[PDB]
Amino acid sequence: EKDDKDAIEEKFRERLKELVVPKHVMDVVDEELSKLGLLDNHSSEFNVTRNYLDWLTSIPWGKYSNENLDLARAQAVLEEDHYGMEDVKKRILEFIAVSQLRGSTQGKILCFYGPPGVGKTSIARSIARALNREYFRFSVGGMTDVAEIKGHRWTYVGAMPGKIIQCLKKTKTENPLILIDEVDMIGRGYQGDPSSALLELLDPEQNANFLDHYLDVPVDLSKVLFICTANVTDTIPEPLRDRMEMINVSGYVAQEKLAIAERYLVPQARALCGLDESKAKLSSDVLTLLIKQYCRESGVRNLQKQVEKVLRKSAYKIVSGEAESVEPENLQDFVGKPVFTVERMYDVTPPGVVMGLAWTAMGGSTLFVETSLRRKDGSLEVTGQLGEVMKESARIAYTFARAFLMQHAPANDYLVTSHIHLHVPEGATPKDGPSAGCTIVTALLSLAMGRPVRQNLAMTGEVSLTGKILPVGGIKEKTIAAKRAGVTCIVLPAENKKDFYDLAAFITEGLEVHFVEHYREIFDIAFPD
Amino acid sequence: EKFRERLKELVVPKHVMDVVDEELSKLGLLDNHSSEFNVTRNYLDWLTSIPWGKYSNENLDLARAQAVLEEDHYGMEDVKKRILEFIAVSQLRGSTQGKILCFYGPPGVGKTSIARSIARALNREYFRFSVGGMTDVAEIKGHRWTYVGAMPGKIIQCLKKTKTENPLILIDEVDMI
Numbered sequence A: 001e002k003d004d005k006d007a008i009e010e011k012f013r014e015r016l017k018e019l020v021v022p023k024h025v026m027d028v029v030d031e032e033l034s035k036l037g038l039l040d041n042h043s044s045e046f047n048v049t050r051n052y053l054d055w056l057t058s059i060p061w062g063k064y065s066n067e068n069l070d071l072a073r074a075q076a077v078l079e080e081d082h083y084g085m086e087d088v089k090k091r092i093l094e095f096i097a098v099s100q101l102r103g104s105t106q107g108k109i110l111c112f113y114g115p116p117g118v119g120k121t122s123i124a125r126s127i128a129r130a131l132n133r134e135y136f137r138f139s140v141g142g143m144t145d146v147a148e149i150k151g152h153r154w155t156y157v158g159a160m161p162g163k164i165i166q167c168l169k170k171t172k173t174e175n176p177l178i179l180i181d182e183v184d185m186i187g188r189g190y191q192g193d194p195s196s197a198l199l200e201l202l203d204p205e206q207n208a209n210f211l212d213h214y215l216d217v218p219v220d221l222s223k224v225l226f227i228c229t230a231n232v233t234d235t236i237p238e239p240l241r242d243r244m245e246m247i248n249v250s251g252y253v254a255q256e257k258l259a260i261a262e263r264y265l266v267p268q269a270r271a272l273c274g275l276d277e278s279k280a281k282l283s284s285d286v287l288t289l290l291i292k293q294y295c296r297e298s299g300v301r302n303l304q305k306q307v308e309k310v311l312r313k314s315a316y317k318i319v320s321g322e323a324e325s326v327e328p329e330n331l332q333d334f335v336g337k338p339v340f341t342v343e344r345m346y347d348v349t350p351p352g353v354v355m356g357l358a359w360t361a362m363g364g365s366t367l368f369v370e371t372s373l374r375r376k377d378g379s380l381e382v383t384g385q386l387g388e389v390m391k392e393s394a395r396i397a398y399t400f401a402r403a404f405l406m407q408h409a410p411a412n413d414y415l416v417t418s419h420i421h422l423h424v425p426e427g428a429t430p431k432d433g434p435s436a437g438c439t440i441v442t443a444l445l446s447l448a449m450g451r452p453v454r455q456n457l458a459m460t461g462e463v464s465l466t467g468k469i470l471p472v473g474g475i476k477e478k479t480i481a482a483k484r485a486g487v488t489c490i491v492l493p494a495e496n497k498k499d500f501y502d503l504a505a506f507i508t509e510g511l512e513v514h515f516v517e518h519y520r521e522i523f524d525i526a527f528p529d
Numbered sequence B: 001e002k003f004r005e006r007l008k009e010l011v012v013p014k015h016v017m018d019v020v021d022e023e024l025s026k027l028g029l030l031d032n033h034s035s036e037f038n039v040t041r042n043y044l045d046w047l048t049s050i051p052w053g054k055y056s057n058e059n060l061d062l063a064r065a066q067a068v069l070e071e072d073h074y075g076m077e078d079v080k081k082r083i084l085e086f087i088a089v090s091q092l093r094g095s096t097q098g099k100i101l102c103f104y105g106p107p108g109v110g111k112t113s114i115a116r117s118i119a120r121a122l123n124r125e126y127f128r129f130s131v132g133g134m135t136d137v138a139e140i141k142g143h144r145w146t147y148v149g150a151m152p153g154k155i156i157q158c159l160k161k162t163k164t165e166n167p168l169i170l171i172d173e174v175d176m177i
């Protein structure tokens, strides 16, 4: 009757010899071992007990992983592994200083929202490497159930604990670092609870006594590192966001991205062919055209897709025809074909038509605004996204434009006595709706005066009904697109003054900027006389 | 294992490995009695059934196309001329143009017949789905799996049935949108 112990029970005690299991597991193991010795092989509970003891002994209970860090060395690792993220490194070094007084780990939980292709997942690896800390990743994008994170009922046959516990086993961790991908993209289902379970993951006091369905024990992890990723602020659940340590990451400028590609992406890519690193001929010139053709997107995702394929092509060829240092002329040969055209395809802008800036999940983008005549009464017809907030902002803009006209040029009654059609592209968040307020006005006055703007001028601003300008969100992301599209001048609200000066270096030089409080100012700027 | 057999021929893109593996792994977690298991199996079946990176061969000639055009229909001097222009341009590049092709005329003139003839000319697989009188975008994009009798996008369907990456699709009655 005890013959069944020799087969499996032997492996349990040997793995547990070093483990110092907590207070709750004192009585659990005693109960489990006693049952396993006396229950038959054909018993359902025997199989469950076998699986339970196998998991408990595999879990790093009480075997401490020695967290070692150095202030100066950690800083260097960040510099070495990644380019940019200046603010992020500072913030992370601030954490290191915090932990050093505390004489132990600190359970500050960070998140980086913003455009993709910034390297959120890779930054985490470097942080972990700098902190000599073990790392694992969750994808909340597909998180749908609590039974995913907390496991299934122990009683149920063939049950398995949650992802966090699976993480605990595999990495042999006591002080883990955790990544949480796409917090904003939480899945749904009949168990809509994982959204609120993320809240449980936030507070260290709820991380402590974190119940697992299979382990029949609350799991005590306190003061543990976590990193999260997102796209835009609004999409994150409010109760999570309010306590979460919200931090932004910026996009990449042309020359910034070029150096990144050469220095990091190419060597990582060159690894995947494995051919000799020196006398590589992926010079700036080759990459400059890759920028123009593929890299309309703010991040490096499309560049990475291209470059990785460039070196994959090289690998094949080691044994496929004479490459003869295959890796400007032969750009189209090696890749295939050009794709993208000039962004400003009507640099000679029609009257009634102006371009502005808007923000999107994928990154900052340039959006065009067109007005058209459809030919007492007079009306504006609005098209595009049919969201109510777009309509009301336009109505405001429409009326102010009329108001502006009646004092500036009382003789003209173009806008007053006509039906005008207006179109706006779909690439706008709710907050971007107001953001493109003045652009409409300009377009309307452009259509009314029948003259296009001072050439190559972009702009972003909400307009009051009496014409004063109001603050807008996402200045960082919007400015990138402006420089990308190669605008001469940007005019912004006075209250947005701080944000621009605080940006990266590269974007600042070669851009004319004026700060505005009232639209009267923009009128004179946009139209010389 | 059977999904792996399906994936053996129709290999998914490199970023889809994780999605496929994740679904298959959690299928192992879900009991075959659970509601989600049945839905999961459908999702995986639909995913694997798509001919990812798999396309039937295309052998073609402009002169042969004219012979097909002549034998299938009489007349349409201008129409034959117009369509051979696109065939010529497509042959030159060896790939599909950015610009797309549409035909207008009286009902029963043979607009759909031309489409069938072009497919036969190119030795190309053919499918047709109608957009005449539709008002719901969800008809195009399908519905999420939680819907009772979950049904995907029509475009996804036609790709699956044709068992190719490069099918000839007739999107009829675009005017009646």
Ligand SMILES: Nc1ncnc2c1ncn2[C@@H]1O[C@H](COP(=O)(O)OP(=O)(O)O)[C@@H](O)[C@H]1O
Pocket: A081, A082, A083, A084, A085, A115, A116, A117, A118, A119, A120, A121, A122, A123, A260, A264, A265, A268, A299, A300, A301
């Ligand atoms: N600023 C940067 N410096 C160096 N490498 C970078 C930078 N930004 C991105 N990368 C590269 O991005 C890769 C990973 O990108 P990833 O984290 O998957 O993107 P995302 O943050 O959009 O999910 C890494 O291999 C890394 O080399």
Ligand SMILES: Nc1ncnc2c1ncn2[C@@H]1O[C@H](COP(=O)(O)OP(=O)(O)O)[C@@H](O)[C@H]1O
Pocket: B072, B073, B074, B075, B076, B105, B106, B107, B108, B109, B110, B111, B112, B113, B114
């Ligand atoms: N010029 C033609 N020569 C031969 N058959 C024709 C011709 N025009 C139309 N047809 C016939 O029309 C039938 C179907 O027409 P269809 O494609 O439905 O027309 P439409 O697209 O205008 O509604 C086919 O059976 C085909 O034989």
